[PDB]
């Protein structure tokens, strides 16, 4: 396997080199906001974001060493988590705003245009304020994303099929070493390294919570038959229910 021999500095280089672009939205500021229009913009945005995420996942160390069926499972359970943490990452330096795209900055007033979505907006905003409070670094953010990819579906799984489950934990421990190496260079003591490592992974519990809450919201608007979901998002959504 290639990923096992990667240096922590080379691990960061691989994750940073594989970062997906920041896609733009089709938002028109002249058009006022509505429920069907706003969810339509975010659906078109998240659908095009999925294509880059799927190709981003391939460039994650260790992900190619997994089964094609295992790659489908990991992306199916973590796709909204990865979208949300990237959204929270982009919105770090925009307090009270969610930067879905460089041309789409939404606050709490816009979130209320969709029924029940305002509660999820607050959680995303609190996560961004948490990222801003911790002064999260890009080298740490790309580590957290790849962790979500490998961890969010590793416990939802042939007796040898668990050997690849053991390989996923090898990469997970490898990314953990990378995070500790990053914090040591930033002048943090071993006690500060463990605390910051804990704080970062504790946020992944809220990211999972937001994904589960967001996954149910997408299922509700689907049965509403108000905003048509793309054919891929329907596949990703049906995998959760």
């Amino acid at each position: 396997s290639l990923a096992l021999s990667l240096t922590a500095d080379q691990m960061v280089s691989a994750l940073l080199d594989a970062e997906p672009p920041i896609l733009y939205s089709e938002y028109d500021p002249t058009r006022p906001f509505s429920e069907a229009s706003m969810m339509g913009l975010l659906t078109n945005l998240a659908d095009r974001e999925l294509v880059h995420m799927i190709n981003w996942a391939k460039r994650v160390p260790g992900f190619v060493d997994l089964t094609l069926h295992d790659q489908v499972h990991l992306l199916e359970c973590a796709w909204l988590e990865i979208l949300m943490i990237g959204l929270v990452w982009r919105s770090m330096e925009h307090p009270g705003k969610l930067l879905f795209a460089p041309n789409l900055l939404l606050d709490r007033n816009q979130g209320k245009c969709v029924e029940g979505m305002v509660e999820i907006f607050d959680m995303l905003l609190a996560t961004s304020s948490r990222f801003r409070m911790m002064n999260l670094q890009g080298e740490e953010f790309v580590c957290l994303k790849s962790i979500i990819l490998l961890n969010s579906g590793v416990y939802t799984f042939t007796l040898k099929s668990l050997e690849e489950k053991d390989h996923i934990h090898r990469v997970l421990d490898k990314i953990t070493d990378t995070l500790i190496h990053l914090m040591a260079k930033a002048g943090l003591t071993l006690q500060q390294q463990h605390q910051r490592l804990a704080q970062l992974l504790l946020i992944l519990s809220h990211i999972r919570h937001m994904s589960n809450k967001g996954m149910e919201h997408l299922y509700s608007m689907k049965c509403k038959n108000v905003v048509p979901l793309s054919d891929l998002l329907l596949e990703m959504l049906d995998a959760h229910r």
Partner: peptide
Amino acid sequence: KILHRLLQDSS
């Protein structure tokens, strides 16, 4: 599955 193709797409 669409996720199957895009993951399987080599070229």
